[PDB]
Design a protein around this motif. Structure first.
Motif: not given
Ligand SMILES: NC(=O)c1ccc[n+]([C@@H]2O[C@H](COP(=O)([O-])OP(=O)(O)OC[C@H]3O[C@@H](n4cnc5c(N)ncnc54)[C@H](O)[C@@H]3O)[C@@H](O)[C@H]2O)c1
Ligand SMILES: CC(C)(CO)C(=O)C(=O)O
Length: 305
Positions: A267-271, A289-291, A299-304
């Motif tokens: 909802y920020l950089l992706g939006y 930057l988004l990539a 890399q840390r198992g967090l949702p992208d």
């Protein structure tokens, strides 16, 4: 006597709003996720607000999404990635006259919430108040701020704003609320993604002057093509201004990744990247930057997202 303030999402800002609303005499009702959360909250006795080290208990009434009376005014105070699911859990209780206060950063969830609740009025909020959780039902009022309110469809201000004035909740009505949220979003994109990729406080971005300028460059084109020439004009100086003012803090997204939690990147950089592609506007540096930030999250198992 008037409308109950139903609070959905008893988090940092949700508890801060619920405390100031209920302690000012206004009818307030916390909507807790489930009956287990409810009977824990009743074992706790209420919301604990910490102000300059002083803790105060606020025995605010609470309930679950299934019971209770109709909801005519609701403060949605969850993350942006939970707003649509949160609002849907009480769609069976909205009244048709119902108004929703959307305390979500970034953009995307507000439109998605409004799309699923068409018989209801969704007002957009943008807040700079600092608050963080120190355990369940305990929130520290960390920093004072301001909350812009506004409806892009219905630009007339509701008469219940002065109730927020009575509760000591600083706010200003804005007729172009989308211009506000787009300013906070563009500032977020120029600062937060690089703070995570470089593992630095906001003051560390001074060591990246060129890269900050090229992002504000592309974020400048995005705002201009979106109808906000003023935001696009002051953008770079507004970014450089916030940096020195917050040079000692770690950004919210840096703090999310540090705690191993999901970010609001979708909802920020992706939006912002989504909107640029929709505008046919090539934004390659925000794209790389988004990539890099999505791969940093995976890399840390967090949702992208
Ligand atoms: N100082 C601040 O905290 C601050 C400042 C500006 C903007 N915001 C924005 O406000 C929003 C909330 O931020 P936060 O720090 O308070 O997050 P939080 O995690 O501390 O609070 C979220 C609460 O909502 C509840 N939630 C999520 N989904 C739910 C659901 N489906 N049903 C019921 N409850 C649900 C969660 O349990 C939680 O209690 C964010 O979008 C944030 O960007 C916060
Ligand atoms: C978006 C911004 C720049 C606001 O200060 C930020 O750094 C944060 O949210 O933590």
């Amino acid at each position: 006597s008037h409308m109950t303030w139903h609070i959905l999402g008893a988090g940092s800002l949700g508890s801060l709003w619920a405390a100031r609303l209920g302690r000012a005499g206004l009818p307030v009702r916390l909507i807790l996720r489930d009956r287990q959360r409810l009977r824990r909250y009743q074992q706790a006795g209420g919301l604990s607000l910490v102000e300059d080290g002083q803790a105060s208990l606020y025995p605010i009434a609470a309930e679950t999404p299934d019971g209770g009376q109709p909801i005519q005014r609701l403060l949605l105070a969850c993350k942006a990635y939970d707003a649509e699911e949160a609002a849907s859990s009480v769609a069976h209780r909205l009244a048709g006259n119902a108004e929703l206060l959307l305390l979500q950063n970034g953009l995307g969830s507000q439109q998605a919430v409004a799309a699923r609740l068409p018989r209801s009025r969704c007002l957009f909020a943008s807040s700079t108040e600092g608050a963080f959780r120190d355990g369940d039902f305990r929130v520290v009022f960390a920093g004072r701020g301001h909350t812009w309110l506004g409806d892009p469809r219905d630009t007339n201000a509701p008469a219940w704003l002065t109730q927020l004035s009575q509760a000591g909740i600083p706010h200003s009505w804005s007729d172009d609320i989308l211009e506000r949220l787009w300013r906070k979003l563009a500032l977020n994109c120029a600062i937060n993604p690089l703070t995570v990729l470089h593992d630095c406080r906001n003051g560390g971005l001074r060591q990246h002057p060129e890269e900050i300028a090229a992002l504000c460059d592309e974020l400048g084109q995005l705002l201009h093509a979106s109808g906000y020439d003023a935001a696009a004009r002051s953008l770079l100086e507004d970014v450089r201004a916030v940096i020195d003012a917050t040079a000692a803090n770690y950004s919210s997204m840096h703090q999310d990744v540090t705690r191993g939690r999901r970010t609001e990147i979708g909802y920020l950089l992706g939006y912002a990247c989504q909107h640029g592609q929709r505008l046919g506007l090539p934004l390659p540096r925000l794209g790389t930057l988004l990539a890099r930030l999505q791969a940093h999250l995976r890399q840390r198992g967090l949702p992208d997202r």
